[PDB]
């Protein structure tokens, strides 16, 4: 099917440059113009600079200084955008889009001088006097990571219903988030539950087993 | 006369409406309204019971498949997508237009993408005209150059007939005279 | 640069009702017979998808429940039977003059009957203690409406310093809201007490809904 796989979740030191890739699949690369969009939490969507997969491109004077759009017509079928001299106003989510259908997953760029700290995962299981009930809620606390971008998955997807991903919070340069999952009480103490947290910005993945 | 038009196994598309001729033969416009259950027989000029008594090469049959909500567009003076962009009747229209539902034939689980319709055009269609152009319609000040995007749209859209859709979103089939 | 101003910024509607949002443009986004407006929908945590192109035309894969109307300078997006999955942000974007501009957005949330929060407390893992810290978690899941308040108690006394709260957008399945509260504290400051308590205050209960535990 039509797919726009973006890379990303990248920490970039202030003032450096970065190149975001977006690979296209399921459609002919040359028949569809490609647009790049910027979204910062707090601000709305901003600006559509386009590349015609056949030379031509057009930007916005607001980005006609930090944005350089190119593409590889060849087997890559990949559109690239290079962002130059990244200031703190440049950390955001950038999307590649096809003018029709879903946009790419979005690359989150974080421009900071901080060192990549991996997340610390902790299991949250009730114990010592819990009256069970028809169902039980377990959790995973993902604390002390940077930069933002963390994905928690329960039982590799077997527990996708009754899941809650709480947005992350920045308290002193580090991020903290939580995830909850509710399951029938007849299961968890018998059939085990495992939480798999993924940090792409550190290329790390940690799995924790919840036990009473 | 002939009946392989209405009893045809494959009907045309709106933007490519299929015309058929009939001459040097006899046509009985009365018993036509017998193999019927026709949901539409809109008629302008003379009644078919009276027109059963004369006949030039005027005998023309235009077949295609439209949208339910759009059957009202195959009528003189009407505007819209089909009238302006697919099949335009004149204002001197002297004939009849016959229609009927066909959801059990031209519908699919997952949509039927065979029937299409023109959605954009630089100018309205002159009466009795057939446009099969497939060029990227320039919507704004931009030459498109064989590439789609914001503006510059592909002009032919598919109906995607599903059975779960409503009667307006259901198929049909039209005639002419 | 046409300025796109959306109204309202936040619309609440009921299941099956009609929802309408409007977009004003400083200039006319019309050109030679077509209105160069687009409507995009971004569900919570998803990339935006194109709903409407050329102001009134619907893109493939978009249900007929969405419709586009308006003229030149004032445009409207309508949803005739609002379904539970429509919880999303809605952006209008123009394309008659480069640069292409977007609107401010419109968060569409869904009205439903009240729901009491299921509250669950969680002591700190024994291994966070080895790190020197101790974080007590409390989940308040599936509550409606959005308004909710949280009090942390310890040995009876209220604590308000090391408390951090996180909220979720409305769920596409429940139309409810969940919330997490973390009381972070030192392992040394944690062993100097016994009972910990998470109290929720919501429309559905005149009395605070309480979960608690003791360090024994």
Which domain range does residue B75 map to? 1-110+163-177
Determine the 3-state secondary structure of A201 from DSSP.
Answer: helix
B56 and B92 co-located in one domain: yes
The SS3 of residue A138 is strand
Can you tell me whether residue A200 is helix, strand or coil? Answer: helix
What separation, in Å, do the N-terminal and C-terminal C-alpha atoms of chain A show? 44
Interface touch A32/B146, C-beta < 8 Å: no
Please check whether residue B149 touches A, CB under 8 A.
yes
User: In what side-by-side order are the strands of the sheet with C205-214?
Assistant: C157-159, C149-154, C195-202, C205-214
**A–C CB contacts, 8 A cutoff, strictly below:** 117
**Which residue is listed with tokens 């087997």?**
A75
What residues in C contact B141, CB-CB < 8 Å? 31
- 3-class state of residue A127 by DSSP: coil
3-state secondary structure chain C: CCCEEEECCEEEEECCCCEEEEEEECCCCEECCEECEEEEEECCCCCCEEEEECCCEECCCCCCCEEEEEECCEEEEEECCCCHHHCEEEEEEECCCCCCCECCCCEEEEECCCECCEEEEECCCHHHHHHCEEEEEEEEEEEECCCCEEEEEECCEEECCCEEEEECCCCCCCCCEEEEEEEEEEHHHHCCCCEEEEEEEECCEEEEEEEEEECC
A82 vs C27: CA distance, rounded Å: 32
Method for this entry? X-ray
CA nearest neighbour of A119 among A141, A140, A142, A139: A142
Backbone torsion region of residue C53, taken as left when φ is above 0, otherwise alpha when ψ lies between -120 and 50, otherwise beta: beta
Interchain CB distance below 8 Å, B150 and A35 = yes
Partners of residue A164 on adjacent β-strands: A180
Is C180:C138 a contact under the CB 8 Å cutoff? Answer: yes
CA distances from B20 to A2, A21, B1, B171, C202 (A): 40, 54, 11, 21, 72
Same domain, B5 and B79: yes
Token pair, residue B160, equals 């995607």
Instruction: Region of B159 please: left (phi>0), alpha (psi -120 to 50) or beta.
Output: alpha
- Tokens representing residue C153 in the block: 């108690």
Residues B105 and B139 in one domain: no
Q: In angstroms, what is the C-alpha Rg of chain B? A: 17
Same domain membership, residue B145 and residue B118? yes
Which burial class, exposed, middle or buried, applies to C95 when counting CB atoms under 10 A from its CB (0-12, 13-18, 19+)? buried
User: Which chain C residue has the Cα nearest residue B123?
Assistant: C33
Q: Phi/psi of residue A41, each to 5°?
A: -50, 120
Compute the distance between CA of residue C171 and CA of residue A162 in angstroms, rounded to an integer.
10
Total domains present in chain B: 2
CB atoms near residue B8 (< 10 Å): 13
C61 and A47 within 8 Å at the Cβ level: the answer is no
Structural domains for chain C = 4-111 (2.60.40.10), 118-214 (2.60.40.10)
Q: Are strands C177-186 and C195-202 parallel, antiparallel or unpaired?
A: unpaired
Residues A35/A45, Cβ–Cβ less than 8 Å: no
Whether residues B58 and B144 share a domain: the answer is no
Residue ranges of domains in chain A, CATH in brackets? 3-111 (2.60.40.10), 120-210 (2.60.40.10)
Q: Quick one: B96 and B167 in the same domain? A: yes
How many of the other CB atoms lie within 10 Å of CB of C33?
11
The answer to whether the Cβ–Cβ distance between B147 and A33 falls below 8 Å is: yes
Q: How far apart are CA C122 and CA C145, in angstroms?
A: 24
Q: Quick check: A69 and A57 in contact, CB under 8 A? A: yes
Contact, B11 vs B106, CB < 8 A?
Answer: yes
Token pair belonging to C97: 């003059």
**Residue burial A121-130, b: 16+ Cβ < 10 Å; e: rest:** bbbbbbeeee
Task: Go through chain B and tell me how many residues it has.
Answer: 177
Q: Are residues B87 and B142 in the same domain?
A: no
- Please identify which residue in the block is written with the tokens 């972070």: C184
Contact B39, B99 (CB under 8 A): yes
State phi, psi for A210 to the nearest 5 degrees.
Answer: -90, 125
Residue A117 burial (CB count, 10 A): 16
Q: Residue C68's CB: how many other CB atoms inside 10 A?
A: 21
Collapsed DSSP state (helix, strand, coil) of residue A157? helix
Phi, psi (5° rounding) for residue B49?
A: -65, -25
Give yes or no: residues B6 and B77 share one domain: yes
DSSP A118: P
> Which chain B residue has the Cα nearest residue A49?
B150
Q: Answer for the pair B121, B156: CB distance below 8 angstroms, yes or no.
A: no
Q: Give the whole-angstrom CA distance, residue A4 versus residue A26.
A: 9
| Helix, strand, coil percentages in chain A from 3-state DSSP, rounded to 5 | 5, 50, 45
Assess whether the previous peptide bond of A138 is cis (omega < 30° from 0).
no
SS (H, E, C) chain B: CCCCCCCCCCCCCCCCCEEEECCCCCCCCCCCCCCCCCCEEEEECCCHHHHCCCCCCCCEEEEECCCHHHHHHCCCCCCCHHHHHCCCCCCCCCEEEEECCCCCCCCCCCCCCCCEEECCCCCCCCCCCCCCCCCCECCCCCCCCCCEECECECCEEECCCCCCCCCCCCCCCECCC
Please name which of C182, B110, B72, B61 lies closest in space to residue A175, comparing C-alpha atoms: C182
Q: Could you give the C-alpha distances from C123 to A57, A123, A162, C182, in angstroms and in order?
A: 56, 10, 21, 10
B134 and B155 part of one domain: yes
CA-to-CA distance for A150 and C27, rounded, in angstroms?
42
- Beta bridge partners of residue C75, listed in sequence order: C23, C70
Dihedral pair phi/psi, residue A201, rounded to 5°: -65, -20
**Chain A interface disruption, residue of C92, C102, C216, most A CBs within 10 A:** C102
The Cα–Cα gap between A197 and A210 comes to 13
Asked if residue B102 and residue B31 are part of one domain, the reply reads: yes
Joined tokens for residue A23: 């690979």
Task: Say how far apart CA A193 and CA A159 lie, in whole Å.
Answer: 9
CB contact under 8 A, C47 and A105: yes
Q: Is the dihedral angle over the CA atoms C170, C174, C177, C180 positive or is it negative?
A: negative
- Residues in C closer than 8 angstroms to B140, CB to CB, are 31-32, 34, 36, 95-96
**Of A36, A43, A40, residue with least CA distance to A59:** A36
C119 phi-psi bin (left φ>0, alpha ψ -120 to 50, beta other): beta
B152 with B170, same domain: the answer is no
Question: H or E stretch including A207?
Answer: strand A204-209
CA neighbor of A9 nearest in space, from A211, A206, A203: A203
Q: Left, alpha or beta for A153 (phi > 0: left; psi -120 to 50: alpha)?
A: beta
What DSSP designation does A190 have?
T
Residues B54, B41 share a domain: yes
Contact partners for chain A, using 3 or more CB pairs closer than 8 A, are B, C
The resolution in angstroms reads 3.0
Sign of the CA dihedral A44, A89, A37, A145? negative
């Amino acid at each position: 099917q039509v797919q726009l796989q973006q890379s990303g979740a990248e920490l970039v030191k202030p003032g450096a440059s970065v190149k975001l890739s977006c690979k296209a699949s399921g459609f002919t690369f040359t028949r569809y113009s490609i647009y790049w969009m910027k979204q910062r939490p707090g601000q709305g969507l901003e600006w559509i600079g386009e590349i015609n997969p056949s030379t031509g491109d057009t930007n916005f004077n607001e980005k006609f200084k930090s944005k350089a759009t190119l593409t590889v017509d060849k087997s890559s079928t990949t559109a690239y955008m290079q962002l130059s001299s990244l200031t703190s106003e440049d950390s955001a989510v950038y999307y590649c889009t096809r003018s029709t259908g879903y946009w790419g997953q979005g690359t989150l760029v974080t421009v900071s001088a901080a060192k990549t700290t991996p997340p610390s995962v902790y299991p949250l299981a009730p114990g010592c006097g819990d009256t069970t009930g028809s169902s039980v809620t377990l959790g995973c606390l993902v604390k002390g990571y940077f930069p933002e971008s963390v994905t928690v998955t329960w039982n590799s997807g077997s527990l996708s219903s009754s899941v809650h991903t709480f947005p992350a919070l920045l308290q002193s340069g580090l991020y903290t988030m939580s995830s909850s999952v509710t399951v029938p009480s007849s299961t968890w103490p018998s059939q085990t539950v495992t939480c798999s947290v993924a940090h792409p910005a550190s290329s790390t993945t940690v799995d924790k087993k919840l036990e009473p | 006369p002939f009946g392989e038009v209405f009893n045809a196994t494959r009907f045309a598309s709106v933007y490519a409406w299929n015309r058929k001729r009939i001459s040097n033969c006899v046509a009985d416009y009365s018993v036509l309204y017998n193999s019927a259950s026709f949901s539409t027989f809109k008629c302008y000029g003379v009644s078919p019971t009276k027109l059963n008594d004369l006949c030039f090469t005027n005998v023309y049959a235009d077949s295609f498949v439209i949208r339910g909500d759009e059957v009202r567009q195959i009528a003189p003076g009407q505007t819209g997508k089909i009238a302006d962009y697919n099949y335009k009747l004149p204002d001197d229209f002297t004939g009849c237009v016959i229609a009927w539902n066909s959801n059990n034939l031209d519908s699919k689980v997952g949509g039927n993408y065979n029937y299409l319709y023109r959605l954009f055009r630089k100018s309205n269609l002159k009466p009795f005209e057939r446009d099969i152009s497939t060029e990227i319609y320039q919507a704004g000040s931009t030459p498109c150059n064989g590439v789609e995007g914001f503006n510059c749209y592909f002009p032919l859209q598919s109906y995607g007939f599903q059975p779960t859709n409503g009667v307006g979103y259901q198929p049909y089939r039209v005639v002419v005279l | 640069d046409i300025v796109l101003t959306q109204s309202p910024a936040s619309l609440a509607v009921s299941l099956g009702q009609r929802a309408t949002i409007s977009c004003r443009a400083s200039e006319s986004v019309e050109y030679h017979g077509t209105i160069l407006m687009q409507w995009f929908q971004q569900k919570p945590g998803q990339p935006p998808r194109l709903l409407i192109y050329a102001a009134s035309n619907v893109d493939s894969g978009v249900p007929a429940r969405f419709s586009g109307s308006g003229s030149g300078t004032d445009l409207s997006l309508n949803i005739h039977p609002v379904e539970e999955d429509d919880i999303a942000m809605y952006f209008c974007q123009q394309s008659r003059k480069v640069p292409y501009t977007f609107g401010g957005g419109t968060k569409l949330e869904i009205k439903r009957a009240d729901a009491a929060p299921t509250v669950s407390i969680f002591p700190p893992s024994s291994e966070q203690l080895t790190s020197g810290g101790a974080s007590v978690v409390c989940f308040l899941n599936n509550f409606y409406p959005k308004d909710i308040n949280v009090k942390w108690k310890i040995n009876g006394s209220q604590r308000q310093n090391g408390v951090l709260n996180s909220w979720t957008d409305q769920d596409s399945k429940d139309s409810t809201y969940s919330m997490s509260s973390t009381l972070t504290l030192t392992k040394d400051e944690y062993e100097r007490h016994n009972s910990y308590t998470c109290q929720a205050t919501h429309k559905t209960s005149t009395s605070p809904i309480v979960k608690s535990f003791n360090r024994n």
